[PDB]
C-alpha cells in the first residue's frame, strides 16, 4: 500500500532489470512470455537512476519486458511502470 506505479508518460528510456528480477514482468510479476519492451519516463531514468532496476531498484543487467498477457490487454500502454515508495525520500537507501 506504500508502493505505486509512476504512471507518467513514458519516453525513449528503455526499462532495465537486475539479476534478481531478470525474467519478471513489471506489472504482474510473471515469467511466462516476455513480449514488448518496457519504456519509462525521463524522470525515472535520471542521475543515479540510470540503468536501475524497475521493480526493486538494483544494478540492472538486462532490459525489462512486459509479458504477453499484459501486451494482449494493452497494459504496456499505461504509464511509466517504475515502482516508487511513498514512505521514503530520494536519499534514503
Amino acid at each position: 500500500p506504500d508502493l505505486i506505479f509512476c504512471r507518467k508518460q513514458a519516453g525513449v528510456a528503455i526499462g532495465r532489470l537486475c539479476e534478481k528480477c531478470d525474467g519478471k514482468c513489471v506489472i504482474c510479476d510473471s515469467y511466462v512470455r516476455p513480449c514488448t519492451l518496457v519504456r519509462i519516463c525521463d524522470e525515472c531514468n535520471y542521475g543515479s537512476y540510470q540503468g536501475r532496476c524497475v521493480i526493486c531498484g538494483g544494478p540492472g543487467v538486462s532490459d525489462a519486458y512486459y509479458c504477453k498477457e499484459c501486451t494482449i490487454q494493452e497494459k504496456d500502454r499505461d504509464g511509466c511502470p517504475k515502482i516508487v515508495n511513498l514512505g521514503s525520500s530520494k536519499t534514503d537507501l
Binding site: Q9, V12, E74, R77
Partner: protein, 863 residues
Amino acid sequence: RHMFLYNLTLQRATGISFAIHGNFSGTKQQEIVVSRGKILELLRPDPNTGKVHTLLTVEVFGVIRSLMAFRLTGGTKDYIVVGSDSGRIVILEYQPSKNMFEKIHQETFGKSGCRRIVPGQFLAVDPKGRAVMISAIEKQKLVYILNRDAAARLTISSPLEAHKANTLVYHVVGVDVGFENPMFACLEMDYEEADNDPTGEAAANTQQTLTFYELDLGLNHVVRKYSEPLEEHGNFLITVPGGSDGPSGVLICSENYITYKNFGDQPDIRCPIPRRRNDLDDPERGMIFVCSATHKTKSMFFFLAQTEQGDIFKITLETDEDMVTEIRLKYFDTVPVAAAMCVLKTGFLFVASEFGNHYLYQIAHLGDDDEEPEFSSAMPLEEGDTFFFQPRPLKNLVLVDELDSLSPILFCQIADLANEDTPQLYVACGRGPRSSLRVLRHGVFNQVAFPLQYTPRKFVIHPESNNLIIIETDHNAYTEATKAQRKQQMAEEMVEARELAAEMAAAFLNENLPESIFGAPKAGNGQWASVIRVMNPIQGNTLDLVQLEQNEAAFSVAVCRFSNTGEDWYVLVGVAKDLILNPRSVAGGFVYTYKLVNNGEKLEFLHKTPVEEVPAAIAPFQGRVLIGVGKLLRVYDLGKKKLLRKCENKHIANYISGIQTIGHRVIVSDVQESFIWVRYKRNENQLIIFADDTYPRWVTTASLLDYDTVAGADKFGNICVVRLPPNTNDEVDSQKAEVIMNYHVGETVLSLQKTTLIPGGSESLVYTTLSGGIGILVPFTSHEDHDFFQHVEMHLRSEHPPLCGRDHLSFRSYYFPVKNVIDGDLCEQFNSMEPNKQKNVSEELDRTPPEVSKKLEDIRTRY
C-alpha cells in the same frame, strides 16, 4: 461442418482519405503518398507523358487518421509521419532501391482504437522539421522533438505533454515562425460551461477559440501562450509561409468567411467567401471549404481553396512591411469535390476526389493575365451583400490523367449476363452526378463505366431479358421538373426589380451547367430525388426511365412474377415520403407496382399502394412478394387496384433493412439487432418468429450459405457467419443462433455473394467495399493446409508487424474476437520480407521459401 476461411483482396481500395506530395525518392522528382484507408500507396507522376504510376502499395492493417510529410534542415529527402489508430506514432522513409517503407521510428503513448482522448486524429509538423505534434479530438496533445545524429540518421525524443481538459480540437497546424521556437495553432472549444448550464445559455454563448502552443527549446516544454475567440466558427486552418518569405500568421476557413490572423499587433483581415451567380442551391445553406493546398516559389506563393460546390479559388496575400493588409481571391476553374489537393513543381495538380475517380491536371495559365475579376478584403460591401461568381469550363487546367476509383460501391451482383464463360461483376457505385454502373472483368480488374443520374441504391436483374432495373435516390437534391421550375422562378423574379435583364435571364435559362463537373443543384433538408432506370448490361444504353416526386425516395426494388396473373413480369419499387434523417420523421411510403412490357424494356405503371412506413425491403416469394415496412413484415399479393396483404408479422425489433428467403425460412435483417428467422406456415397464413441472435449487429448486406447458415456484414467493417442449431423446430421459439465466424476487414462491406469467379475452380464468398475494394473468402480443403496457413499467420504476425504499430490480431478483432478466418493479405507479405527472415520462417515451416511462395500462389490460382 467447421467453416475455416481465407481472406484475399483481389482489387484493392481505390478511394483516398489523405494525400501528400514531396521528394520521397530523395531526388528532384516529386512523388505522392496517399492513404486509401488501411493501405498506404506511393505514386510517381511522369512530367513527360503526364500520367500517374503506382510504385508501391502496402497493407498497414490499421486506420490512418492523419498523414503528413516533413524534412529536416538541409535534408535531401522527406520522411512520412503517420497518425494511426494504434497508440503509436510512426515515422518512415522510402528507400527506392528496395521499394519499401522503412520504419525509422515508432513511439508508443496510448491505447489502440479511434479513441476520443488518445492522440492520433490530428497531426501537425513544424515547417523546418524540428518537431511534430500528434493530437486527439479532446484533451490530450503530444509533441515530439526531431533531430539528427552524427551519421545523419533521424532521431526522436520523449513526448512533451500539452493537454487541456474539457477541450475539443477542430484542427491543428504548425506555424512557420522561421527558426524561432516552434508553434502550433489549434482550433479549440471548451464544453465545461455548456455542460453545467441546464438552461442552454452556455451552449450558444461558448465560442470557438484559436490558441497557440509554443515549444520552448531552451526550457524544453510546451506552453499555451495566446488564445483568442473568433466570431465565426471555422472548420480548418492553413499555414502561410513565414520568416524569410511571408508572415507567420495562420488562415482560418469558416462558414462564409476566410480570415487571416497573426499573433501580436496584426489585425484580423477577414474576407467573405464568394458565392455563385443565381445559385440553384438553397439560400439558407452556408458555404465552407473542403480542402486546401500550398505552393511556394523563390518569388511568390499562393493557395488553392475548394468549396463544397467544387469551386477552386486562388488566394494571394498582399503584405506591406511585415504586415498583411489584403486578402485577394480569384476564381480558378471547377473540379469535383476533393479531399486533398497537391500542387507539384513541374506544373501539375493532383485532385483526389472524396468519391469517384481521381484526376491529374496540367496547369496552363495561373490566372494572372485573364480579365476575370479579382476580389479583396478591402473592397466595400454591405453586410448581407457578398461577392458573386459565374463558373465556366476548364481554361487554366487540362486533364492529363484520369485514375479509376470504384469508391463508393453501393451494390454488386456477380453474374454472366454477357454470354461468356467467366462471369462479370456488375457494380452500382459512384455518388451524385458522378455515379456509375460498371462492368468488371478479369484476365487486376478491367472496368467499363456507364454514367448515372443519381446515387444508385439497389438494382435487380430481369431473368428473361437480362436487363438491369436500377433505382437511383439522393437526398438534398432536385428532380428534373423541380429544377426547371425553380430556374423559371429565378428568371421571373430576375425580370422584376434597364431591361437587359430579360436577355440575361434568357441566357441563364438556355445555359444548363453539366451537373457532373459543376455539381448537382443541392437544396433542402428533406428534399429527395428518385429515378427508376432500365439499362442493358452489354451497351451503355438506357431503355426506359421513370421520375418520381420531389419528396419520394426509392429504397427497395424487385422484379418478380405472380401466380395471380400468368407469366407476365412485374416490377415493385418501394418509396418513402417526407423522410427526415436527423431527427427521424417520415410521413409514410408507397409501393409502385409496374407491369414492365416489351420483353424487359419499358415500364407500364399499374398502381400505387400506400403504406405506413418506408418499404425498405422487397423480395419475391412463391408467386407472392415479401415486403418489409418498418418493423412490419408482410406478404403481399397482386390486386387490380392495390397490393393487398395476406399475412403480417408485427414483432420485429426495430426496422427491416433486407429479407432473403430459402424455402419457407425468411431471414429478416434489422438495423441494430441482427437476423431474425421467421417461418411462413403455409397452412393458417401465419408468420411465426422462431430465431434471433444473441449479439446486436448493424446489418448492411446478407447472404445464405445453406438452409441453416447466414453470412452478414456490419456498418463497422465486420463480417460474420451465424448458423442455427441443427436440431431446430420452426414451431418451437426462443432458438438462438451461434456465431461460427467473425472477422474485421477494416472496410465497410455492402455486398456479399457466394459465387465461383472462374468457371471450374472452386466456390468462394466475394464481398465488396464501401471504399471501393473487392475481396474473397475461400474455404479450406484439407486441415493440413489450414495448419500451414495458421502457422504462416502466427509467424508473420511477429516477424512482419503492421507498418503503423497496430497489432494484427488486435486489429482483425476490432469489435469481436476473430473466429475461423485467416488473413491472406498478411500472408502474401512473406515475399516482401528480408532474406534472413524468409529463410528462418521457412526453416521453421520445414520447407523452402520458394515452396511457401508457390503454396501461397496456388490459392490465388484456386479462387
